[PDB]
């Protein structure tokens, strides 16, 4: 039996237990409620075994994954925050919590590998993974070498093999399907075959253990090291001048490494649940709590939204990005905004003039978007959203186009300059996939049809065409890199599909806008010629043909959603959210690109698997194809 009037906490020695402990004393003052924390050895293991029977802690702080399966044997009781203080969480991060609906467990901390790097032998770390052999060709004849992290573990390589499309479970409404594997598909495939060929050309050796890397990478010998938060200290001691920044690309889209989600459980067996209830919302789940157990031990990210933009000032995640990859997109936005996850409204704006950079640009979109996330509820049309949109057009030094739409009623909220022409810029890709899946609707076209390009195809800015040259790419996966990661000949190989920018303003025409138009190809119909009506729209003729593609019946409720999805993405990446829901450390970053561990015991035949198939196709035992061929048998049928 646990004894009533006090709280107990379980949480692993190697966290700020200190820290927290100072919470529990604030805590007694307040109460006069006592509250102990310990750090049993293997709590992970003592906690299932004394709360069945009914003793143990009030409260256990554990990595989420493993709460699925005390919440099964009933061992967690259901917590109960309000949406108010659910909206102060990362969405995600209550995902990891969630067990056959309900809530079992408050999100605490958030854990991922990141990309540790030497400022003194790499002040610019690579952004992609394909640039890594040559960087260590350059390292490796000054006597050092560019990466070194630890390939025993499938944990590590993860990331790098799951990049390109690879995954462990697929998640949908809300559950984990335990026959849905990708550990075999294609994506997975090409980025265990890079792995392996870093090892054949001598870039990393195969035998490269966590001890090994750790060690290498705190006595200056490689630039950098893939490693996560709890690793931080042995460095700081080491005296390396490191920072940690967002894991490479590979193929153009981010690397996923898994996240765990320290969490705190309320044990079902506990008289005291309102209490720890009280504690854990109104004491731990603050900055000053917060602060607290990070300043014992670091946390890495947290869960909280106010206090990881506290930690995002730490200048060891400060970049110096020098692409203008951003140009297009400052020039041009449109998104559908809405909360719950479900869209409302459409916003279209567009930026003018050569005076202007793109940080510039991008900052007054952020303050636009800010200022409309401020006045919700309001209904939109706020006199201060309205001075925010002036302002960009007086800082800029040109005109600013905007439109707010609701899109459901066709209702304006709020616009300036809305029948001005402007250049499209991107903002026709959301348009020509939306015609794309018209003809899929019309059983035209698949969305899995693979499509051949050269490298004469290629165009700027065209990150991830650019990297699948010899197995080509899905219109799927076309769409998906014109919308989300804005790449320019992934737009030309669709507007082929079609027929050309004739197709699409004939397409666009068909439907009731008689406005826009699509005259050139990418980059061309980017110039901007003053004047210039050739590749332009207007604010509310964009804003209405959008609705119609997201209303009504145009494209059918399967094509709808995949349209929203591409959109969302675009969305995140875009500046217009940057200073509202803004980007948090490279630890968050890199979570917020990865992949939640599922807390399912099928997990345990996936580590094996994985483990045995990167061995096998390093050493030589088995091909990659193989390797992972044999992998994914070894957990589904
Ligand atoms: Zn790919
Ligand atoms: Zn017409």
């Known amino acids: 039996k646990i004894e009533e009037g006090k709280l107990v906490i379980w949480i692993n020695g190697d966290k700020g237990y200190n820290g927290l402990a100072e919470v529990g004393k604030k805590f007694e003052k307040d109460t006069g409620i006592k509250v102990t924390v310990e750090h049993p050895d293997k709590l992970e293991e003592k906690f299932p075994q004394v709360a069945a029977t009914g003793d143990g802690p009030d409260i256990i702080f554990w990595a989420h994954d493993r709460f699925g399966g005390y919440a099964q044997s009933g061992l967690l009781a259901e917590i109960t925050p309000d949406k108010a203080f659910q909206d102060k969480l990362y969405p995600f991060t209550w995902d990891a919590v969630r067990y056959n609906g309900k809530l079992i467990a408050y999100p605490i901390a ?4 990141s990309l540790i790097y030497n400022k003194d032998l790499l002040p610019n770390p690579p952004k992609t993974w394909e640039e890594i052999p040559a960087l260590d060709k350059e390292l490796k004849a000054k006597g050092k070498s560019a990466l070194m992290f630890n390939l025993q573990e499938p944990y590590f390589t993860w990331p790098l093999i799951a990049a390109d499309g690879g995954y462990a479970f697929k998640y949908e409404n809300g559950k984990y399907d335990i026959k849905d594997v990708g ?17 054949k050309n001598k870039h990393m050796n195969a035998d490269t253990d966590y001890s090994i890397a750790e060690a290498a990478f705190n006595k200056g ?9 709890w690793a931080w200290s042995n460095i700081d001691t080491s005296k390396v001048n490191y920072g940690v920044t967002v894991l490479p690309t590979f193929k153009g889209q981010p690397s996923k490494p898994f996240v765990g989600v320290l969490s705190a459980g309320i044990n079902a067996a ?29 946390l890495g990210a947290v869960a909280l939204k106010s206090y990881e933009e506290e930690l995002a000032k730490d200048p060891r995640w400060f970049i110096a990005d020098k692409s203008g990859a951003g140009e297009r997109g400052s020039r041009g936005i449109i998104a559908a905004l809405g909360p719950d996850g479900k869209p409302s409204r459409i916003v279209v704006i567009y930026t003018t003039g050569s005076q202007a950079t793109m940080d510039e640009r991008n900052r007054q979109i952020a303050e636009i978007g800010a200022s409309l ?11 201060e959203t309205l001075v925010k949109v002036k302002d960009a057009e007086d800082q800029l030094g040109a005109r600013v186009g905007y439109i707010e739409l609701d899109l459901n009623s066709g209702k304006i909220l709020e616009s300036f300059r809305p029948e001005e022409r402007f250049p499209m810029m991107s903002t026709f890709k959301v348009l020509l996939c939306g015609a794309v899946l018209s003809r899929i609707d019309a059983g035209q076209e698949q969305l899995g049809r693979r499509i051949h390009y050269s490298q004469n195809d290629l165009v700027e800015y065209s990150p991830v065409t650019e990297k699948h040259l010899t197995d080509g790419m899905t219109v799927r996966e076309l769409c998906s890199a014109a919308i989300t990661m804005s790449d320019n000949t992934a737009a030309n190989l669709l507007l082929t599909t079609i027929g050309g920018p004739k197709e699409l303003t004939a397409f666009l025409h068909n439907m009731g806008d008689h406005v826009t138009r699509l005259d050139r190809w990418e980059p061309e119909l980017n110039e901007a010629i003053p004047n210039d009506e050739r590749d332009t729209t207007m604010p509310v003729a964009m804003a209405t043909t959008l609705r119609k593609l997201l209303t009504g019946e145009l494209l059918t409720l399967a094509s709808r959603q995949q349209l929203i999805d591409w959109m969302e993405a675009d969305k995140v990446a875009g500046p217009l959210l940057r200073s509202a829901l803004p980007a948090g450390s490279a630890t968050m970053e890199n979570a917020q690109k990865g992949e939640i561990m599922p807390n399912i015991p099928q997990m345990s035949a996936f580590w094996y698997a994985v483990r045995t198939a990167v061995i096998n196709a390093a050493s030589g035992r088995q091909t990659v194809d193989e390797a992972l061929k044999d992998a994914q048998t070894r957990i589904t049928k």
């Open 270 to 298: 506990s008289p005291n649940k309102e209490l720890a209830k009280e504690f854990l919302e109104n004491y731990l789940l603050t900055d000053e709590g917060l602060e607290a157990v990070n300043k014992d031990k670091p």
């Open 221 to 229: 010998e490689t630039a950098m090291t893939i490693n996560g938060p």
């Open 373 to 383: 996330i401020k006045h919700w509820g309001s209904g939109g049309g706020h006199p």
């Open 110 to 113: 958030v854990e991922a590998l």
């Open 183 to 199: 550990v075999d598909n294609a994506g997975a495939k090409a980025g265990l075959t890079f792995l392996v060929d870093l090892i």
